[PDB]
Design brief:
Chains A, B, C, D: It comes from Bacillus cereus (strain ATCC 14579 / DSM 31 / CCUG 7414 / JCM 2152 / NBRC 15305 / NCIMB 9373 / NCTC 2599 / NRRL B-3711). Chains A, B, C, D: Keywords: Isomerase, Magnesium, Metal-binding. Chains A, B, C, D: One of its GO terms (molecular function) is racemase and epimerase activity. This is part of a larger assembly, with four copies of chain A. By secondary structure, chain A is α/β, with parallel strands linked by helices. The first copy, chain A, has two domains: 1-115 and 351-369, Enolase-like, domain 1 (2-Layer Sandwich), CATH 3.30.390; 116-350, TIM Barrel. The first copy, chain A, has 13 helices and 15 strands. In chain A, β11 (290-293), α12 (300-311) and β12 (316-319) form a beta-alpha-beta unit. In chain A, α2 (59-74) packs across α3 and α3 (82-92) runs antiparallel to α4. The A-D interface holds A 197-200, 203-204, 206-207, 221-222, 225, 227-228, 231, 234-235 and D 216, 234, 237, 239, 259, 262-263, 287-288, 290. The complex binds magnesium ion (MG) (4 copies). One magnesium ion binds at residues 191, 193, 218-219, 243, 265 of chain D.
Amino acid sequence: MKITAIHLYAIRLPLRNPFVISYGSYSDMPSIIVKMETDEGIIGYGEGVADDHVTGESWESTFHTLKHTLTPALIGQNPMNIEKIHDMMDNTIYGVPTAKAAIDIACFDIMGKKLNQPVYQLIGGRYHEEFPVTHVLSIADPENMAEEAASMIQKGYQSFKMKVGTNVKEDVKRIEAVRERVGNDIAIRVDVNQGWKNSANTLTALRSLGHLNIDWIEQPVIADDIDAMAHIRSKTDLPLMIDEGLKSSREMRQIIKLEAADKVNIKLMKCGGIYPAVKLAHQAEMAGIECQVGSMVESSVASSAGFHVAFSKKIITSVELTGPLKFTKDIGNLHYDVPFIRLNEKPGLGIEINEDTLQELTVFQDIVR
Amino acid sequence: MKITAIHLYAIRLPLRNPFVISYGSYSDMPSIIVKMETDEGIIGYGEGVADDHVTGESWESTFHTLKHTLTPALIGQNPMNIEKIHDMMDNTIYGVPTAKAAIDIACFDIMGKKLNQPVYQLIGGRYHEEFPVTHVLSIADPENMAEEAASMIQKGYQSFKMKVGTNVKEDVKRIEAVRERVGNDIAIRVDVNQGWKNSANTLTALRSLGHLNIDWIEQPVIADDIDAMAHIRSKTDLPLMIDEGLKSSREMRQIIKLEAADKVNIKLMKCGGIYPAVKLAHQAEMAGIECQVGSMVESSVASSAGFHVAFSKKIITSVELTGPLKFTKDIGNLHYDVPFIRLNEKPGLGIEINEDTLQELTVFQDIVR
Amino acid sequence: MKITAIHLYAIRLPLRNPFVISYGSYSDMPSIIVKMETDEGIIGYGEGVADDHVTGESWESTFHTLKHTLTPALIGQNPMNIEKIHDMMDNTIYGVPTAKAAIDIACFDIMGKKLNQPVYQLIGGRYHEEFPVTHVLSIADPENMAEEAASMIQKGYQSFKMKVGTNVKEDVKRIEAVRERVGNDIAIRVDVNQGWKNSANTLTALRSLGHLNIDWIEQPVIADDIDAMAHIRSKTDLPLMIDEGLKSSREMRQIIKLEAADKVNIKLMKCGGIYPAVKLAHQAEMAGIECQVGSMVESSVASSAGFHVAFSKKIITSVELTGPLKFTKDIGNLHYDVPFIRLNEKPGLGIEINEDTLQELTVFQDIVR
Amino acid sequence: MKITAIHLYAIRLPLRNPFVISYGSYSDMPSIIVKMETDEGIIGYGEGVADDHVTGESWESTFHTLKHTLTPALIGQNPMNIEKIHDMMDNTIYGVPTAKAAIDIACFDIMGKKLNQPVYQLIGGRYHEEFPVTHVLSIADPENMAEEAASMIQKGYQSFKMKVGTNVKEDVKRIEAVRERVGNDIAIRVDVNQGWKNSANTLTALRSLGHLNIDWIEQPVIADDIDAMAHIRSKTDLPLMIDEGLKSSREMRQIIKLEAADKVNIKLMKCGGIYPAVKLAHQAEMAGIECQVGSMVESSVASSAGFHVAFSKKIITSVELTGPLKFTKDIGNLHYDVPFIRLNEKPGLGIEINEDTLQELTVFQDIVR
Ligand SMILES: [Mg+2]
Ligand SMILES: [Mg+2]
Ligand SMILES: [Mg+2]
Ligand SMILES: [Mg+2]
């Protein structure tokens, strides 16, 4: 098989409400979509949604490194040889995981369609039947968050994720707020997106959260400080999860060596797609580190890609890909049986792309052959 | 898909000459072959060749743990879900990698045949085109080994592996013997199969081998002593490879933590097959540890299984599966283009089993449904 | 002071001869030039030359992250507050050191012009009077390199840098070749640009280079493996320098902690400019790690920026910015008194930009206000 | 530019009230002032206030090492080359940070005046707009301290620093005293100036201070024991700050290596001035250690010098230079907008020296040319 052409679509996925986190507010979500054509007529879709604050890739920058750097080197290349495809990309350019993920995903889509089989079947088979979905509450006021949780509660939701990290004294204020508001049977996990910066602030915050029964604290310090994470872990009994601090096997190695975390948040956009994500899961498994497959706010394309990885691995015990249900328009149709996700048995990503929706969301595009 | 029956064949592969190593001599090679039947009529072949001295599994013991423990729990199970298949096996019994490998291989064979694709395509695609084959010289006298190398030299062979480990003063005697005999362009690697026992003996031996230009020393100390391996590595500039010291991710973790080796020898029979072997490769990759896929003396069935793993991974840079060309009868037809191995494009293991040869080599058998 | 506009020029600097290294060959050098305008009429020039293989930034990608991400956030911002400028950039996007360097340099140019003083005066004053220039010999055949050195020898050159890393047995072949060719008074340093990959290969190579009197070995293993670097350093007496393995303070911290190197190669394009480079020098100083300011093949703009950092710091003992003398056309006029570099006393970068040359080299451009 | 002469003034700054700490009581504050003259008519002021108990420098000793050792070697030297100036001083004499600070400050004053720009503009630009000022309560009785805080409370003050360290059982007595007295919104930090000596006493004291909500504990053990500091940090969740334990990069390196502190108190008098202080800030930044610029009780001269460093660095988050507002007479006019400090835009230290006040406070003097 040979790649004959690659279409690049710089689109914008509309959000029902502004997504608010520690380092920024989002009114919508820019994304790069790729359509990969092969000499065998089989086509695959991939997606790259860049987060400037995490991987240093932007919407426009990703579009262009795909256009001028990665795609030209991929024409004529075989999408069935995933290891080879990644070797070529890594050799032509270092890093740029989001751009590489977009290509990786399309290759697996093509692979699955070609073998008339869902992606998870190409990376280990199906292991999970379903995963519960947890509702992420954007940074809001103590009662505005306690309330948004009250609503989702009466819709089946069993667990929530509170985004905090503006001010320790305030973030705490919001926690017991929703904890009290939802009883003591609703699971609660908190993500501070580096908001507490260092171990001193973090440890101070944690002493005020021991009675609230939090499942785990996610990335409390700045991404680059894995050392701080290990120091925190040495003085607290609250499970710790690393997110921005983990991108590729490079930091995975450090996390294992320093025993910096109880769990890691793997995101296709941080490591370069399905294949690299599988490698991370295998690495985390060796050290008994539990994994989660999270994501940037992504369309059905990347989201399903993430679920396929999740559904195929026993070490992946939680999932956080809810972009498709935050947008008012999606170019794909990944179906959620809220409060659960179950994958169908369809080939490739098991998704259908609405050409009309894609085209109306496209701000600019190009084709490379 | 569902497993409907599993046939177990306890066979014996005849050897052209006695295979001699540090802890034993072999006149032939006992092996367990498995034929897996599915409700879809698709059949797969797997193989388990036990080495009592390495994994504590024997020919008969493997046959029986397969018959009474593993196979009954696998009937009705789906061979397409490799992760699930291994989860079931691990849950019913700990360890027993050789027995599990036999089942793992048959599942991949079925998977490949089902998707009309070679195994390597299911675990990363094709990465390598070919690998050079190195000739293993069994433990013999200084001139008997120097000679056997002289022969293979004039047949294309570019690299050899000397099996040593009876007596340091003697093993050394054999090395310069063949080194001198073959010039200084022929690659030479030495495997002592734990023969030197500890770091003191090993370090003494190594000082007498610095001028001979050896590619690497393989497993010089007793398997369980990873610490000794790291100590040796701290005081020598000769690359070190761990073989018997590595079986599953359990020791891989220790090897990475202690920086005990430059390279590892992965064998499907030590870790439980293709899937576990792929996980080891990914783990070794995180630490920059080069991998080799070696083997016990195996028929075409396990041997091809090993090659499929090797051919799909950039981190695997050398290969050592030469059983098919040491036997006078093989139940399979894996083709070697000595001094190279190249895999064909056929589905599954890309091999054909000669029922007649299988049956004449079978000493006893059973079927489980 | 306020930034009123920023012009972006995607140019291409023509090379007299192809620049060859371990991971690629260059016929010319793509670069992004920035012209920063202020409400006070003072203008500054900056430059960003991306190396896809090191920081994962490309020519086009850098142009765009500058255009759509960094520059819009900088309009109205004060270029005199360098710490503030960097805070703004880091807050809007993570990494992207080459793009940030382009802006950093223009700000210092403006700062120097504004205070009618050379850049080095704004970062510690002048410390060095001059630095010797060493000639870099691109990867060639053993005698083609021995020869190119013979030539430069009779032009004043006192030290050379051999680019190697294709094959250990070959790279070595080239070393004694030029060493023998130039006597034993000519300094020789070797850069393998990750070519030997790991410590095993590296240590093997090093034993064959002990008699050649090499000043230091530069980045012998893959960038991400700082651990391998420390392991190598524990078993060799040859000074080691880290290049690609060092980008920002993030790896500097690791290098210090693990004692992975004797010296580091700081490049404005890897850390984000003059200010971050000064911080690295201060950090390296705390651990007694000697520094060198090297570079990507850059025009007079970034090259002088690098020299200003070098000339102001006692801890920086060698310099490697020779792009201006490899090009057949330069947009600036940095003057080299081969075999030495001395900086003038002119304000800012102390350079003059030839508008005509800039414009003829520009492939595409834009302006942001 | 060239230094033509250096005037040394041994003065005494009168204190409104006796300053009491763990290891001594002060009725006034001896200080050494330097006036540096250049061939360009530009003059700069510097200051050195020695603390015998911290750096082993005394009022008279500093005056003389300046007179007979440092100044003679500086005549004819260029004050614009700060890196060079420090190299010369370090080469002529080791340590003596207070004496060197006095010279360092005058050089920056001259530099700023020469470039008609404030000092902070020469070391990174302006980053901060203002810093809150915290009121330091000298060692007194439990109610005498609770009271002094009650007063300052009704003057805008938002945070206080309690000097303790005479007796654990007593020091604690004073803490809840003022904590109770000022409510739970007033920030409180405690400095024991080595008073608890070791980790045993310290850890015992800390268990009795967990409920009082202290921002951080400063230097609880003897200066030289960085190990004790790390041990304490391993068993407490209270942020720890090192003061006397930190002087130059020498101990900064140790603090980073052993993870001995959450924050450090940088003082120009302990490291040799503005330039060395900036280097410490950059070093602390690499490890994510927060910095504070504190001081000995200093006049407007050194105090402004300290603020210029503070205002230019994001890593410096708190400030403690309140000498100008403890004296009844100051030779300078640094203006405080209690409870805040904001620096003006004037060149150099942005201060004016009252010759008459200087002269009446001078006990003895000399001039060196
Ligand atoms: Mg997160
Ligand atoms: Mg072996
Ligand atoms: Mg280099
Ligand atoms: Mg203090």
